[PDB]
Amino acid sequence: KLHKEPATLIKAIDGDTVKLMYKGQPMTFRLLLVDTPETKHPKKGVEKYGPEASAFTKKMVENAKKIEVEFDKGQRTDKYGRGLAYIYADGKMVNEALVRQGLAKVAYVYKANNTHEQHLRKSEAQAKKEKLNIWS
């Protein structure tokens, strides 16, 4: 089953992307099962709530004492070379926190990487009941 591995923060890039030192090598990680408003969107400019999601992720990983990555069962890298994982800051999954705060939507499953989809779905449901940020 899944297991967490240590990593070291290098730089927070976007609400859904963080650069980390994983096993002695820098890597860009794309947070699994989440879709945050972008600030660095190819087409379309700084989307609504983009700055908020970026600040949220940034704050969470920078203030953490221990960063851990957790790959799922499917493909572990996307077509851009970004690792696909669940990121944890001091035991708290950053993917879930974003959703729970209404700063991200739960994305489509990417090649069998859906172990935590149900959990995330529940948090997203709650965030919309509470009309949080995106769900206003």
Side-chain angles (χ1 to χ4, degrees):
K1 303 179 180 182
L2 310 188
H3 61 114
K4 304 174 214 312
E5 301 178 77
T8 302
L9 171 72
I10 291 183
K11 182 183 188 299
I13 303 300
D14 221 332
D16 62 13
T17 305
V18 300
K19 189 97 64 187
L20 311 173
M21 191 68 97
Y22 175 65
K23 289 184 171 182
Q25 62 205 277
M27 274 195 80
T28 301
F29 281 83
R30 169 61 251 253
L31 271 48
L32 267 176
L33 290 162
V34 154
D35 279 340
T36 60
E38 291 190 49
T39 52
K40 305 174 63 189
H41 200 201
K43 59 181 185 64
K44 175 183 299 184
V46 178
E47 305 171 77
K48 187 59 172 60
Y49 291 114
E52 284 59 46
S54 312
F56 190 97
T57 301
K58 186 172 188 301
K59 173 79 178 172
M60 201 168 163
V61 293
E62 295 194 324
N63 303 135
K65 306 189 306 180
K66 301 178 192 291
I67 297 292
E68 296 177 303
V69 297
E70 181 181 69
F71 289 97
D72 209 336
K73 306 155 305 156
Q75 313 186 167
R76 298 174 178 155
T77 66
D78 66 356
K79 63 187 181 75
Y80 296 96
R82 305 183 298 183
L84 297 172
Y86 299 114
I87 303 298
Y88 296 81
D90 292 328
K92 266 205 63 189
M93 194 198 298
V94 180
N95 311 48
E96 190 278 333
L98 284 170
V99 171
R100 184 56 184 90
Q101 285 294 92
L103 293 170
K105 288 194 182 182
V106 45
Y108 283 106
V109 174
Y110 189 67
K111 272 80 158 193
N113 289 310
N114 59 0
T115 296
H116 298 317
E117 178 192 17
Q118 254 39 78
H119 181 55
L120 275 55
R121 290 293 186 180
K122 295 178 177 183
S123 292
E124 186 192 48
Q126 187 54 225
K128 69 176 82 305
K129 287 171 199 164
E130 303 176 8
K131 283 70 169 56
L132 283 178
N133 300 293
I134 292 178
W135 313 116
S136 300

